[PDB]
Design a protein around this ligand. Structure first.
Ligand SMILES: *O[C@@H]1[C@H](O)[C@@H](O)[C@H](O)O[C@]1(*)CO
Ligand SMILES: *O[C]1[C@@](*)([O])[C@@](*)(O*)[C]([C][O])[O@@](*)(*)C1(*)(*)O*
Ligand SMILES: *O[C]1[C]([C](*)[O])O(*)[C](O*)[C@](*)([O])[C@@]1(*)[O]
Ligand SMILES: *O[C]1[C]([O])[C]([O])[C@@](*)([O])[C]([C][O])O1*
Ligand SMILES: OC[C@H]1O[C@@H](O)[C@H](O)[C@@H](O)[C@H]1O
Ligand SMILES: OC[C@H]1O[C@@H](O)[C@H](O)[C@@H](O)[C@H]1O
Ligand code: NA
Lengths: 231, 103, 103, 103, 103, 103
């Protein structure tokens, strides 16, 4: 459906366009996975926010309302004289953190939805401007957005996420419902570090597969048809 | 001059409208001799062809056949919802005459 | 030589500008013989054609007709905002002569 | 007329189906004289050609050869899953007759 | 053989480089008789055409004129940054000879 | 028949491989008379052309030249990684004979 999510960020629209979207820490470009990135939801969710709204460990956070995003924004970014609130379509790269982490969600009050690998430009509906903590309530539309594609999609269900929860290898969660039914090999199950390596490889495989879907939706329309008979 | 696919399909004998309101499930393309054609299916199993060019086609249709193959390929890739197809049903698979995309 | 669609449209008889500032709502395409054409609509109900190539057209327009159908297809699929259309008003639906995209 | 790639492929001698269900790993294209062709590989190492046009081809295949190279290029760039290929096995690498994309 | 657009432009009389380093603001295309052309603008108001094919053009340029309209349409729709145009400045608006894209 | 770009390039005396494993930095296209060509650069300054069609080309190569310019344009816009180029090295810039794309 056409629901939107919201994120406060000091990186301005031109940086977003150049990066191909809203990126997790340490990634300069969406589709370019030439650099190392740890992907782990639990670590993402328990990370501290020091002048950046949570974007570590391979995910990028959103709020479920504009009010909530604005509140978050005042808390973290009040030292900036300008920042942006990005309005974001729902799609299956988004996970409801409370639902996936359950009772172990570290900040349940925040009601976070987090995007694995960050948010591609095409998924960004638009952006508001915030000046000196004051929300300017004009919405600037992104020409790159695709409404029919994204309005036909929703966030990922929690059961697509349980296996990516990223709890420590011997955490009680891996032996409790629901996570027990989705535990990566080595997690609550003779080379060291299997759980960590499988958590990471399942994340990388998810993002590979997701990026394939984005490439298909966007790059398809770069196809220029040729007059085959003339040629 | 028709203003929509239903009125256009009504001008021709041996046609019918199929209402799909769905994206294309599969796209098949062939360059084999005497089978230079495309075939699409939908998730319910409904199958449609773009016919091999032949004596049933006037010269002005040759370029439109090529255009239709282009349209189905990019519709498949972009997952565009197909609203309706106008087909001839004196062929199997039913043969595409026109396509509409909305929503 | 004109510098914009309005001035170009003013050089022809039986033509007018429509200002849509909106994406295309539907795209229809036909390969049926003598109806090799495309039809677009907008959510306000306005309907437009790219005409079948015919004796009214000169040679230089043949390639341009094919290009215009290609442009409407990709405009529909990428949800690009159509600014204006220059159309002939002596056809029903009105027949596209030019398109401008902005914003 | 066949309803699918498997049936189409059984109409011809010296052919077989390869089931890939995977995106293309590499795409190669050449304009070098007597080697105007394309080559694709999958991550499992399976390699396939679109043949150089020659006297084994009838005239109706010429346009279809060009379309297939367009299809493979965009499939590669979009990371679209290839379901099956129908190929001639009396050439090295196996020569593409038809492709299906699904899922 | 020039290595870049600036050196290419220097080989021709009545040409100049515009350095833009910006996306196209508007794209206009016409199929009207004797005006089969494209026009682009930038947000500073700079306006350019791809000319109607005519007697000033040699045969080898006719495919290249078609390619250039393809290129401008897709650059516009994908918001691609245009670095420079090479244009003939004995036409109004200035007529495109070459384009470079980069960031 | 070769199964990869390295083996294809080894079939010609005046060609060599370049390994890039990078996206294209810039794309330039010209319709100017006698310079109907494309030029690409990488961020390390490596520069390549698609040559103007000429008397060194056999008829079969003419359609492949046109295809290769389309390929470079979409590779540029998608930021696809170019793996290798096979080029004629008796020309300046080196002239593309083949391209391979892979991650
Ligand atoms: O069809 C267009 C218009 O409706 C007609 O009056 C004129 O004669 O030809 C136009 C096509 O170029
Ligand atoms: O020499 C010459 C070179 O340079 C090139 O052009 C080729 C193409 O094919 O040819 C010859 O070899
Ligand atoms: O039309 C332009 C170019 C295109 O080749 O040709 C020259 O002769 C003209 O001066 C210029 O306007
Ligand atoms: O039938 C002949 C050959 O035996 C095959 O290997 C292919 O080259 C086909 C192409 O139609 O032609
Ligand atoms: O991290 C060390 C622990 O690892 C678990 O896999 C094991 O069940 C425990 O008994 C303890 O050895
Ligand atoms: O123009 C195409 C159509 O031609 C008719 O003669 C035929 O009966 C239809 O099935 C369809 O092929
Ligand atoms: Na959605």
């Amino acid at each position: 459906n056409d629901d939107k999510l919201y994120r406060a960020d000091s990186r301005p629209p031109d940086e977003i366009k150049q990066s191909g979207g809203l990126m997790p820490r340490g990634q300069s470009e969406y589709f370019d996975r030439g650099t190392q990135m740890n992907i782990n939801l639990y670590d993402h969710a328990r990370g501290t926010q020091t002048g950046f709204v949570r974007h570590d460990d391979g995910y990028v956070s959103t709020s479920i309302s504009l009010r909530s995003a604005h509140l978050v924004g005042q808390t973290i970014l009040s030292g900036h004289s300008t920042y942006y609130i990005y309005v974001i379509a729902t799609a299956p790269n988004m996970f409801n953190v409370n639902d996936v982490l359950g009772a172990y969600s570290p900040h349940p009050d925040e009601q976070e939805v987090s995007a694995l690998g960050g948010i591609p430009y095409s998924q960004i509906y638009g952006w508001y401007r915030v000046h000196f903590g004051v929300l300017d309530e004009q919405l600037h539309r992104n020409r790159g957005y695709r409404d029919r594609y994204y309005s036909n999609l929703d966030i990922a269900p929690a059961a697509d996420g349980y296996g990516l929860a990223g709890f420590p290898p011997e955490h009680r969660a891996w032996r409790e419902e629901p996570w027990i039914h989705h535990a990566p090999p080595g997690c609550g199950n003779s080379m060291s570090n299997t759980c960590d390596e499988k958590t990471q490889s399942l994340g990388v495989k998810f993002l590979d597969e997701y990026q394939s879907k984005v490439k298909r939706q966007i790059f398809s329309g770069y196809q220029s048809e040729v007059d085959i008979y003339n040629r | 001059t028709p203003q929509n696919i239903t009125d256009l399909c009504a001008e021709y004998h041996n046609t019918q409208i199929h209402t799909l309101n769905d994206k294309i499930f599969s796209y098949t393309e062939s360059l084999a001799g005497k089978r230079e054609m495309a075939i699409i299916t939908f998730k319910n199993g409904a199958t449609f062809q773009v016919e091999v060019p032949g004596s049933q086609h006037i010269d002005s249709q040759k370029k439109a056949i090529e255009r239709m193959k282009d349209t189905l390929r990019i519709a498949y890739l972009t997952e565009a919802k197909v609203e309706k197809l106008c087909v001839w049903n004196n062929k199997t698979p039913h043969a595409i005459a026109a396509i509409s995309m909305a929503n």
